[PDB]
Amino acid sequence: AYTPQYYPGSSHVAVNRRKHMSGDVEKLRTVSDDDLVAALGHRAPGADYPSTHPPLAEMGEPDCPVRQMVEPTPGAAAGDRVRYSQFTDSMYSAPSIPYFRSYYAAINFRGVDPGTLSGRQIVEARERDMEAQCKAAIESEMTCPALAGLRGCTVHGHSLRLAEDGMMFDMLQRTHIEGGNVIEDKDQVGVPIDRKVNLGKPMSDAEAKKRTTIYRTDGVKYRDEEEVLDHVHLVHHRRTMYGYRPETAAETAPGVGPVTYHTV
Amino acid sequence: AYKYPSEKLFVEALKSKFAGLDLSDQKVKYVRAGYLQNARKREFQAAGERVAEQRGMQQYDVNVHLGGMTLGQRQLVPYKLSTRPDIVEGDDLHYVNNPAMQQMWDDMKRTIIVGMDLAHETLEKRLGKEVTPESIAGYMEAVNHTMPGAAIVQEHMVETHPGLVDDCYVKMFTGDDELADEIDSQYVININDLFDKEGQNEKLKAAIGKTTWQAVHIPTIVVRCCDGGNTSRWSAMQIGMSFIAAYNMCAGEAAVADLAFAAKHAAAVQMAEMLPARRARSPNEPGGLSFGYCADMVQTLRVKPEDPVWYTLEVVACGTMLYDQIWLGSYMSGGVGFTQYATAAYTNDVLDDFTYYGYDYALNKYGDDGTAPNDLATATDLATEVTLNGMECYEDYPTLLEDHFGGSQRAGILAAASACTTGIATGNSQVALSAWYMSMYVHKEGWGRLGFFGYDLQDQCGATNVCSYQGDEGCCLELRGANYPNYAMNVGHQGEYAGFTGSAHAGAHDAYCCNPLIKVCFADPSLVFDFSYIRKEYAKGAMRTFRPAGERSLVIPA
Amino acid sequence: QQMWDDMKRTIIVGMDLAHETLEKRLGKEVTPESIAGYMEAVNHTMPGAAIVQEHMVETHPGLVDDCYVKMFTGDDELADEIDSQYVININDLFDKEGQNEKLKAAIGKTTWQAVHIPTIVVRCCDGGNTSRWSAMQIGMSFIAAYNMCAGEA
Amino acid sequence: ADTIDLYDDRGKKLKGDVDLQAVSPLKNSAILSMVNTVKRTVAVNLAGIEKACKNASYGGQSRNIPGREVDIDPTAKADKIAARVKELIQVEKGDDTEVTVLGGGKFLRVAAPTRRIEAGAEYVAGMTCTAAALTEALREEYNLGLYDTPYVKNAVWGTYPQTMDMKGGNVLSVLSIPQNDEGLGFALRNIMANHLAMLSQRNAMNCAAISSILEHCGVFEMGQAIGLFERYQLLALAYQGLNANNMVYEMTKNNGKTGTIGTVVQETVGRALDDGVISVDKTMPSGYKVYKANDVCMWNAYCAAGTMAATMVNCGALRGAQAVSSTLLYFNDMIEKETSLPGCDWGRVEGTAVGFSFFSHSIYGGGGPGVFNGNHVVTRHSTGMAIPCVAVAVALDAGTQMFSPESTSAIVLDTFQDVPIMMNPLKEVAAAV
Amino acid sequence: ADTIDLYDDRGKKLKGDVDLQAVSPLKNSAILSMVNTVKRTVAVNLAGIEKACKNASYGGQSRNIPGREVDIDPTAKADKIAARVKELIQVEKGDDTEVTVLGGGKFLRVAAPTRRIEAGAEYVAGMTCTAAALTEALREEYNLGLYDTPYVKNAVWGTYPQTMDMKGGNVLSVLSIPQNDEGLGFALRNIMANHLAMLSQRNAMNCAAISSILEHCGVFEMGQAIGLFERYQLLALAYQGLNANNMVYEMTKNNGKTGTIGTVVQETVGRALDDGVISVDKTMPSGYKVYKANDVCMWNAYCAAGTMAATMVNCGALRGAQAVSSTLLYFNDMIEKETSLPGCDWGRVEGTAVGFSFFSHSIYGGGGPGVFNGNHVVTRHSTGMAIPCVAVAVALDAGTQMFSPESTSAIVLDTFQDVPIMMNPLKEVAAAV
Ligand code: F43
Ligand code: F43
Ligand SMILES: C[C@@H](OP(=O)(O)O)[C@H](NC(=O)CCCCCCS)C(=O)O
Ligand SMILES: C[C@@H](OP(=O)(O)O)[C@H](NC(=O)CCCCCCS)C(=O)O
Ligand SMILES: O=S(=O)(O)CCS
Ligand SMILES: [Cl-]
Ligand SMILES: [Cl-]
Ligand SMILES: [Cl-]
Ligand SMILES: [Cl-]
Ligand SMILES: [K+]
Ligand SMILES: [Kr]
Ligand SMILES: [Kr]
Ligand SMILES: [Kr]
Ligand SMILES: [Kr]
Ligand SMILES: [Kr]
Ligand SMILES: [Kr]
Ligand SMILES: [Kr]
Ligand SMILES: [Kr]
Ligand SMILES: [Kr]
Ligand SMILES: [Kr]
Ligand SMILES: [Kr]
Ligand SMILES: [Mg+2]
Secondary structure: OOOOOOOOOOOHHHHHHHHHHHOOOOEOOOOOHHHHHHHHOOOOOOOOOOEOOOOHHHHOOOOOHHHHHOOOOHHHHHOEOEEEEEEEEOOOOOOOOHHHHHHHHHHHOOOOEEEEOOOOEEEEEEHHHHHHHHHHHHOEOOOOOOOEEEOOOOOOOOOOOEEOOOOOOOOOOOEEEEOOEEEEEEOOOOOEEEEEEEOOOOOOHHHHHHHOOOOOOOOOOHHHOHHHHHHHHHHHHHHHHHHHOOOHHHHHOOOOOOOOOOOO | OOOOOOOOOOHHHHHHHOOOOOOOOOEEOOOOOOHHHOHHHHHHHHHHHHHHHHHOOOOOOHHHOHHHOOOOOOOOOOEEEOOOOOEEOHHHHOHHHOHHHHHHHHHHHOEEEEEOHHHHHHHHHHHOOOOOHHHHHHHHHHHHHHOOOOOOOOOOOOOOOHHHHOOOEEEEEEOOHHHHHHOOHHHEOOHHHHOOOOOHHHHHHHHHOOOEEEEEEOOHHHHHHOOOOHHHHHHHHHHHHHHHHHOOOOOOOHHHHHHHHHHHHHOEEOOOOOEOHHHOEOOOOHHHOEHHHHHHHOOHHHHOOOOHHHHHHHHHHHHHHHHHHHHHHHHOOOOOOOHHHHHHHHEOOHHHHHHHHHHHHHHHHOOOOOOOOOOHHHHHHHHHHHHHHHHHHHHHOHHHHHHOOOHHHHHHHHHHHHHHHHHHHHOOHHHHHHHHHHHHHHHHHHHOOOOOOOOOHHHHHHHHHHOOOOOOOOOOOOOOEOOOHHHOOOOOOHHHHHHHHHHHHHHOOOOOOOOHHHHHHHHOOOOOOOOOOHHHHHHHHHOOOOOOOOOOHHHOOO | OHHHHHHHOEEEEEOHHHHHHHHHHHOOOOOHHHHHHHHHHHHHHOOOOOOOOOOOOOOOHHHHOOOEEEEEEOOHHHHHHOOHHHEOOHHHHOOHHHHHHHHHHHHOOOEEEEEEOOHHHHHHOOOOHHHHHHHHHHHHHHHHHOOOOOOOO | OOEEEEEOOOOOEEEEEEEHHHHOOOOOHHHHHHHHHHHHEEEEEHHHHHHHHHOOOOOOOOOOOOOOOOOOOHHHHHHHHHHHHHHHHOOOOOOOOEEEEEHHHOEEEEEOOHHHHHOOOOOOHHHHHHHHHHHHHHHHHOOOOOOOHHHHHHHHHOOOOOOOOOOOOOEEOOOOOHHHOOOOOOHHHOOOHHHHHHHOOOOHHHHHHHHHHHHHHHHHHOOOOOOHHHHHHHHHHHHHHOOHHHHHHHHHHHOOOOOOHHHHHHHHHHHHHHOOOEEEEEEOOOOOEEEEEOOHHHHHHHHHHHHHHHHHHHHHHHOOHHHHHHHHHHHHHHHHHHHOOOOHHHHHHHHHHHHHHHOOOOOOOOOOHHHOOOOOOOOOOOOOOOHHHHHHHHHHOOOOOOOOHHHHHHHHHHHHOOOHHHHOHHHHHHHHO | OOEEEEEOOOOOEEEEEEEHHHHOOOOOHHHHHHHHHHHHEEEEEHHHHHHHHHHOOOOOOOOOOOOOOOOOOHHHHHHHHHHHHHHHHOOOOOOOOEEEEEHHHOEEEEEOOHHHHHOOOOOOHHHHHHHHHHHHHHHHHOOOOOOOHHHHHHHHHOOOOOOOOOOOOOEEOOOOOHHHOOOOOOHHHOOOHHHHHHHOOOOHHHHHHHHHHHHHHHHHHOOOOOOHHHHHHHHHHHHHHOOHHHHHHHHHHHHOOOOOHHHHHHHHHHHHHHOOOEEEEEEOOOOOEEEEEOOHHHHHHHHHHHHHHHHHHHHHHHOOOOHHHHHHHHHHHHHHHHHOOOOHHHHHHHHHHHHHHHOOOOOOOOOOHHHOOOOOOOOOOOOOOOHHHHHHHHHHOOOOOOOOHHHHOHHHHHHHOOOHHHHOHHHHHHHOO
8 A cells, every 4th residue: 555755854843744644643641531521611521422413323324325334433423513622833833833733633533624724723523533633632742731722712822922931822811830730720712610620831942842843943944944845846836837738748838937946 | 226224124113112122032921901001992992981871782892802801911012004104003004993095995986987089989970079179178177067966957956065075076188198288287187297207108198099088086975875886877977968068969869878878888997897696796896806907006106116116015005905904804794804914914014024125135136127037937936035034034023923913914925025026026927926826835834824714715726827728717917806716705815916916017117007097097196095105195094194085074963 | 875874784684593503513502691692792893893802903983883783583581581772672662553563473483683784884885795794793793602612613 | 379471581472371389489490590509609809819919908998918918910820720729619520510710810700519508508608618719729829838828818708707707808799698687588688789780781671580589589588488478479579570471571661661650550550450450449439449459469469560660661761770769669659549559568668668768868878779688777678579679770770870780790790691590580480380 | 548437326337448528518418418407407396385475475584565465275286286387388298398296295396398498598497487387377276366466476486576586486496597607607516515415315426426517517618628628627527526447436435434534645646656647756855755747637537536535534434514625625735745746626626625614614604515516606716626525525414514405405305306317327427328
């Protein structure tokens, strides 16, 4: 079978990018089921999963060859609501960057609906499936609890100066530092919860720079990642060429000019 | 030629916002003041108290913001109009609060250009009339009495209050210097006087030819009560009345119908055509406005064509406000809207810095304005350098990133700087468009983010549709507009496209981009809004020093 | 001019389908209390003011003083549980010749919003603005009043 | 059933005792062919494309995009371009695709294959396949590339897709775009009268036929020729448009030297009474006679024929199109006063004519007769019994109009002047029976 | 020349080494039949007409015209009304007119005669002739008179002609009115995804075929399948819509138990490389391999099939339609990052998916996937390679949607559930070779 290569680049940022894509992300903390459910805010810890429709086994399904050959996730078999987890990541070397959170979801999880935005990244899925995906991301090196957090609303902060204590600005202050640890005492849409979820310690600035997927001038400079620039150029150029005429002869059409690449 | 200086153009605005701040600091103390920090929010809260008391019903209240927080948990910062000393609160640039912005749009919407040659040919052919400078002069007097809504033929007519329609007028213009000089100058757009730089006047007169045209501006109050579809009709009605009087025609004979068809259709140049059913709109609305026309309405090109960047960014300011704030942020949505999606392109001298950097890079690498190769290789080089440099600016200056806090703002400004640089360097709008999408793609891989959820619909369709020639994909940028299919929905592109359409013709040192009639029409200083310095006008509106047309104080009580 | 502006800036929008969505997809319970919170939200947001994001710029409340939303319904029990400043009182306005009972029977136990966007907006723009402007701020208000994700399916 | 005698444009008998159904849009193969012809046929203005490229005047309306001229000469390569277009659009060898150079290379006549219509939902495939084939043909012939072909594409397609139509483009149809339809089934109603006059080569009898056929094809598609209304519409088509029983030709000839609108009114009434279509009903005390219609649909058809003959006699005498609006109005106003029976389309021709007169003599819109059509808000209101007269008036005009057929429709004349259905529509309809 | 093997919805071989041209919308008789079927077939909601008349709710949207109720019970007289409608619209005995009572009298399935489409310029004759025939049948059956028939007419036609559509009416089509076309040739693109899911009876492989066929029929009518672009579009139809070489079916099965968007990306690249569609071009210093397309059109077709399989795998696993927007986006974003080749429609599927994601998760418009269609401003931008996936996702949904197919398109299921081309599209297309 085909062996994926995922992404170009040779810097340690590109290596981190392939870790997120390939799902090979080290575990740095533990979050209890109850604590995670409490922060996500869709049901009371220990409560039964609400449903949006009956379990598939109970109501049956249309005669569909795709349905009969694609296995439903546990949440879909049960008829769970579609709920979500949503994260914001600082541009000051947070481990994760929005698109690569979505690639991590799309490559490594089934029946997921990821969405990428500059200041928020969302995964919608059947509730129990969404919880498992959220647990995997939040317990992993894709997450610093100071440079990233759950924010289902009022997300402002990814592009702002960090607070003096290194916490990313949150208008609703859903998280705060208590004795070196990040505590979450509101759910992801700002409602106070009757518990204190301990998300462990923030990454050191040096750890963040080692673990991050972002290029910027105080880490791996984007200007120096010529393999990534070559890839961008190649894809743009070929898109341009084949929109003109979808054939290899388009690659030397008048107007292309002396296109050239750094590493190939 | 231009030389990019040692200090970044955006630093002044940062220092004026943050006196004493070390601009390299990545951290800040948050005091979580809430709305009381900000005079404009405090004034709004008090306005809302009056509103609720006067009407008996709750309205504005900062405390309704969710989460038990009011706006201003961080510092609420003001905005400097680029190239201007004026710093304003952000709410002062909301189109609803800014009468200069409202009047720029009203001035476009209430304009139609109408040829006179077909009407004169009708009078000769059907009535055997002689058309002379004297008969044209009488017509121009008639049409400036009738066009605001006053009577010339019938008895016992009721009329519009002249003071409510004081902005309405009609001027003629022609490439024929001999006729233009024979008509009283109050009725004529003087092409030679307004287009005295770089021989622009001769280019415009050659492109118009010995044809005669009317620039018609119907009253602002009318398009405010009604819509842009009113403009060509209103114009035609009073044109017809004026021909009836000026040529002693029957007040309603078959030949008058020929004048109507000419004024309404055959010789009518709309600013914008209609739109399809999902976004149904009359003509002369922003969705139908082409980028070439938008760029030709802006008049900085006739003032200082030797600095193509200045005109380019004035077009950006014109288009981003119109297309994002008024059109997409109101016509096509509404509410709080899209003020800062647009202000990113015309405040704090950020786009200016990124673009002048590119201009300098291109001048030293490729040579003078308009001489760079019209090819994809060149667009790739310019866009990548301009985008990398801008990204490094955001990375090196934390408060610059904080200003353009949404990725969509950064995407539009980095891509605009890239495409404006390319347009000025190559003189080619279509090549510049390749650079626009190149910037987006470079940007996305640098930061693993670009814009909002649906920002790059057109940008991922983008590169491949630049050089398509298929029916609903292929189109030169000058003729693209806010109804080009990929562009029909999303903020952070349309005004920038207008901008670098202008940049390409400024780089080529052309007098216009797309229609010389539009160019001459909007140079006329008798318009309410000053189309030659967009950002200075916006500053006036934000400071409550812009006087719009269309108010009703003459006919309402105190 | 104002008679026409009042017509053009008006859109009527049902609430039942929205409440059914919140129940079905989110398992939310819609109560007089949640509706009351929604009506406050929508009368802050509809004239052009912010409820979710940070560093938002807003319309001057005095320029949009004519903009507001009221609800109305054939269900007297619900109309009675909402602060009357937010309700069109069918029974008080249509007291003659039994008109109120004809209207309530024709509307049924269904809930509606009468939305009136700012005059200044339709003067700058057109009547096509009205249903879009209404929907944007209705959406913002549901997000706030039911603790939704600010942008989910 | 109903039968009619069919007559040609010179009043010669073609066929006798033809079943009225045999000239129905749903049955007559010649009518079906005429519809197919106007749907799939387009004209290409190669001279306009050449001019737009050489002068960078893409989009028209005085537009000029400085620096973006493309120096190509398609009128000098018209045969080569025509051959490529044919190859690109033809579906099968020997199919009904036609591509012909006209005007010495200035224009192309493009009859797109019927299969491309069949394979779609509307009629635009002729326009779009031709525009695309031409864009490709120009790109290949002149070795265009990435950044200049978009401009040449706008020379062909105009401002599409910023606009919904090919505004300022150089692919032409006698039909408009579907989004211009006022309502359901209006596409065949949207044919400018100047176009109709050119299709007929200004033969006014053939113009009546072509325009009436296409109008009633529209009315059938609108669903307004069902049941009893089928007979209503088919009789109007036959007697007003297809010179049934030679009534339009003879009424025009007998009133051509000294006749007026009013003498055609009187002839119509006398023929209706002599033929038994109407009878005296009651007599008022003054001696005025109220008539009754013994066959209501037939009385309408006689009024439709009289309206047309009146148009031919009055506009013919004026040699001017503008009198058609008053002819339609006063023929029907006065035939009602003469009989106390309702006039053509029960007032809908008269009403159309009232507004048509207004909007061809006022400041408010409209224009000369040549700009109207069955989809025009002014002239849409009769189900097919007004516009054929308008087209005939336009054909009869000897040079009084500003926007004449030659100025707006010259390419239409050249495109269809060798098409048999348009050269002799009455003979073709009869031969199809 | 290109050939493909045709496989059915269960992965069974139907026909081997078929010429690609044989599945063209311009040549395959089954495809041409499908177009004709959706054009001329309408449904009648006789229950809705009865309700509107009994309750004076003409026009819908809570309208009530007090005192103007008309008490008629067409659902109780459905067979008699059906027989009259057929008599009124049938052109020739033995033509393809069909009128069938459904739901015990609540609905009528009306297949208007093809000749009525041929005689027109668009497709609306089915809607208009049926509405007219129904109005006459009700008038006659219930002895309606001068002043009540207009109200019953609005029960059938809705608010037409104050509106351009039969808004609030009870004659339904899977197509919209032509004036809603966003551009030239878009009528067959304007088919709501909920409709497509019902036409397929929620058989996802059949849904892909039905939707892909109609999308590409639209693209042909837009003129965007000419010359080289014909091969481009036909390969996408064959591989994405017609399960060419079993690749959509096999890739979905291969990834159906444990697979994801990403594993379908990997399988697509592996197949393209193994099949010689792509090869290694150059290797970067890190070891990253830049690929090249040896056959550009075929690389697109493989990406198109992978996009569809990825939708079936990811939406199939969720049993939820909403993931189609992210599937289309991330399948193509990641396949570009994996190969340095452009993805499906060279970014236009990814771009459509960006805006579709936005407009199915935001306040600004759109809705759930079932409300989109190829004419929707959000989802029109790919030439046919996005919507078939959307329709498939809608069909795979197990009940997460508010505006589900059974709530907006129930009558579509009943109307077409016994139509062979919708029951087994893949088999009929292969049999028509
Ligand atoms: C509810 C949505 C989803 C939607 O459909 N529109 C919203 C909200 C809407 C509201 C917010 C008004 C309010 O606060 O009550 C308005 C003003 C439109 C309106 N209804 O008038 C708006 N957004 Ni939004 N929206 C914006 C933006 C953004 C950026 C903000 C990111 C950040 O770090 O702060 C993100 C998208 C992204 O991540 O790229 C965003 C998302 C969102 N945007 C999320 C809310 C995010 C949150 O929970 O905080 N907007 C921007 O990126 C800048 C311009 C800004 C707009 C107002 C202006 O232009 O002045 C506003 C434009
Ligand atoms: C030039 C036309 C042809 C046309 O297309 N419109 C005209 C003129 C137009 C102008 C006259 C403005 C002016 O005096 O400059 C306006 C106001 C429309 C406009 N352009 O704003 C108008 N008519 Ni007119 N027009 C009117 C009318 C009329 C009546 C007036 C007859 C009489 O005995 O006075 C007659 C038609 C008729 O005979 O029925 C008439 C004709 C005409 N009407 C003749 C001019 C007649 C003349 O030579 O005096 N209007 C009316 O009948 C009353 C309403 C009145 C309108 C103004 C208002 O409503 O306040 C005005 C409506
Ligand atoms: C006919 C049509 O004009 P055109 O022929 O399309 O120019 C139409 N005007 C009108 O109907 C004007 C009606 C108002 C003035 C006359 C009132 S009686 C319009 O502008 O769309
Ligand atoms: C998509 C479409 O909405 P519908 O799906 O038709 O409701 C369309 N709106 C828009 O495009 C909104 C654009 C402005 C707001 C978002 C800017 S990114 C419109 O209202 O016609
Ligand atoms: O959050 S979304 O990208 O949907 C809207 C941004 S204004
Ligand atoms: Cl190839
Ligand atoms: Cl009948
Ligand atoms: Cl009778
Ligand atoms: Cl080709
Ligand atoms: K207005
Ligand atoms: Kr958590
Ligand atoms: Kr976190
Ligand atoms: Kr303000
Ligand atoms: Kr008066
Ligand atoms: Kr004119
Ligand atoms: Kr405009
Ligand atoms: Kr330059
Ligand atoms: Kr990325
Ligand atoms: Kr603010
Ligand atoms: Kr033509
Ligand atoms: Kr249907
Ligand atoms: Mg210079």
